[PDB]
């Protein structure tokens, strides 16, 4: 069915719309931007003599293009056929690549949504989404990008993250506030993220191996993901997807990459709330994997050794978790999850380690707080 549909649409090409029609087309990204401008414009969007009152032409154009991109991405052949090397599947994927440029997809992902804001009286002014740019439109582009072009190189992965995905994660973190959490923006953006973006990074987790020179971007990614996870309005499936993505990324990340995330976890875990299960398991996995890095004075040759500041952080984590578990009332889930974490941290920490009297003084509650996170 995909081959028949793609053959017919490519035979009779005006189905793609004016932008992709092929006669001086401004392009997919330019059509996206122009439709956004039309949606902002009141005269062009409406009849001027909600949906029943006025079908928003800008939203209609954007929805049409998103549906076309989604249909093409679903018409793209599966990866197993390409791996087998079927010439028909290779030809279809090449045809779709010729149809849709990569830069236009990257630009459409780079486009940023309008923002719900607190008003003077205190209520939340919520932009009407049926008349504006919506995360589902970018979800379609992410689906096309994954199925057609693919993500196989770390350079493209990092560039895509930095240009398009990190701003959306930061926007979701900004919406994670209690007042704006119930807004349609928070729910839709969380749905889009946990459905398309986070699973894509989970599948492309092994590409995060050699990111030594891009350390700041990955640290920002970890911080944004952890704040989104601490977010309250998330459903069980969204929470599970975020947990899986964070564990997968931190598993492949280099031990010196995650130090600010370790400091955040050191502060957050000892409260031992229901939210602490994923941080506890992540600490368990990290310490179990990198016990060679910490305890052994030589450490991993490629990954170096500890700077002993993270060693102080690990010891404080161990003691805080031990005390919190000791005073905490028993329940099987948290105790069974906490025991491996304590064992792993105890194993990772060198027994001979000398806790320095002069640690970095005045640990700052600025980048670190429960009240607004900053």
């Amino acid at each position: 069915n995909a081959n028949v549909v793609v053959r017919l649409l490519i035979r009779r090409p005006e189905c793609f719309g004016p932008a992709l029609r092929g006669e001086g087309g401004n392009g997919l990204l330019a059509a996206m931007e122009e439709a956004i401008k039309i949606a902002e414009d009141p005269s062009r969007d409406g009849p001027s003599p909600e949906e029943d009152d006025t079908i928003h032409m800008g939203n209609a154009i954007m929805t049409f293009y998103s549906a076309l991109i989604d249909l093409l991405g679903r018409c793209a052949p599966e990866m197993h056929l390409i791996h087998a090397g079927k010439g028909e599947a290779i030809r279809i994927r090449s045809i779709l690549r010729s149809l849709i440029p990569l830069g236009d997809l990257v630009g459409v992902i780079s486009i940023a949504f309008q923002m719900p804001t607190i008003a003077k009286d205190g209520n939340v002014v919520e932009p009407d989404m049926s008349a504006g740019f919506c995360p589902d439109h970018k979800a379609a582009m992410v689906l096309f990008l994954d199925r057609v072009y693919g993500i196989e190189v770390q350079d493209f992965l990092l560039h895509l993250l930095e240009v398009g995905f990190l701003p959306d994660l930061r926007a979701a973190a900004s919406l994670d506030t209690a007042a704006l959490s119930a807004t349609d923006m928070a729910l839709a953006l969380n749905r889009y993220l946990c459905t398309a973006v986070l699973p894509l990074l989970t599948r492309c987790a092994p590409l995060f191996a050699g990111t030594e020179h891009h350390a700041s971007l990955i640290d920002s990614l970890l911080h944004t993901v952890y704040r989104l996870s601490k977010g309250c309005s998330l459903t069980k499936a969204q929470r599970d997807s975020i947990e899986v993505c964070l564990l997968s990324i931190c598993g492949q990340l280099r031990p010196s990459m995650m130090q600010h995330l370790l400091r955040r976890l050191v502060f957050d875990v000892p409260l031992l709330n229901e939210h602490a299960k994923m941080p506890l398991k992540l600490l368990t996995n990290h310490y179990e994997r990198c016990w060679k890095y910490y305890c052994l004075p030589g450490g991993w040759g490629n990954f170096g050794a500890a700077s002993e500041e993270e060693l102080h952080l690990s010891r404080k984590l161990f003691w805080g978790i031990f005390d919190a578990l000791s005073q905490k009332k028993y329940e099987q889930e948290l105790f069974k999850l906490a025991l491996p974490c304590l064992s792993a941290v105890a194993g990772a920490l060198p027994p001979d380690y000398m806790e320095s009297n002069y640690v970095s003084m005045m640990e700052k509650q600025s980048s670190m707080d429960s009240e607004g996170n900053f």
Partner: protein, 394 residues
Amino acid sequence: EIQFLRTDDEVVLQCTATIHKEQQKLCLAAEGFGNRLCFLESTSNSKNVPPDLSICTFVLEQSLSVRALQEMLANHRTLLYGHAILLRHSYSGMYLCCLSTSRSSTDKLAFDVGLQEDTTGEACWWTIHPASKQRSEGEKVRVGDDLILVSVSSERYLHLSYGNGSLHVDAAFQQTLWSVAPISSGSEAAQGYLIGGDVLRLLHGHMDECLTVPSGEHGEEQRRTVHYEGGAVSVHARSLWRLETLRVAWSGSHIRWGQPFRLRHVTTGKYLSLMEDKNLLLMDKEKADVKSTAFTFRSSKEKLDVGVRKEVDGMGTSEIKYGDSVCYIQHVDTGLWLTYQSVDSIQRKAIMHHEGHMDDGISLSRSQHEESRTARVIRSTVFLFNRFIRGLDA
């Protein structure tokens, strides 16, 4: 009887494009060296301007089934509709294909169409389809039916670009009607007999001297003169001439006594002609008209003409023989006979005279494909390098 398109038959892909609400007939063409990109060079105005069919000529080597091609890529025939065909360009020896590299103006989607050396690849092969509703898949291919071809590689038709200011051929998903005209058929051709499009040397009455232009003194005005020289001039490229016929279709057929044709010097790319001073002068392609540039071969010197006879569609009789036969060149309009000036490297001049002389017998000698292709390459290289030098001088 309707002839069926035959493998190893030479055919020009010929399409019509309308401009000023007027129809222009065009043959797809390409130049072997320097420009693998294809172009359309016009044949409608055969009168005023000679069409260069040497580049429009194409050869249908193999006509395999589509799925036969499928498992072939996985690991004399009668052409049929819906069967992949591979075309070899007659002059260059290369194969028509979609380049997959596109200038992409107006239509970013379409690719370009050009020649490539290698036979292997799905790019070379093109799938036939019946443009007419009467014809169907698997039907016999007509001799002169309109046709549409689809590239195997990208499923794009061989398409004509109307939108561009100059007519462009490109691989696109918009269909385009192409008509096939049989230039010649190799199998039915007879050895040693003159056929259209052949490159030949006009040896004069002494057996040895050949009609030629002066050797290159870097002066085209000096080159334009026409005379007889004997010696190494015969083996040189200056003595070579091409016989191109007025007919666009079946131009490769055997040549007949009294059949109007044009004589072109391959090295200079100029057409033999008659001036008002009765002296032969080579002219430019655009300025060479049919009345000015047209000649016939006649076995007998008698004044009475052979008579009016209609063009047949086929190879025809093996009527003119190389070497053995004696041919007298006569201008079609004036009726003058090509004669030797007989007065003062012989460097004896050639003039058109109505009575002529007794020693006007001329014997034709075939030129090898290597020599003809080399001469064409020399002309192209001279033109390009002269353009380069003029640009550097500017």
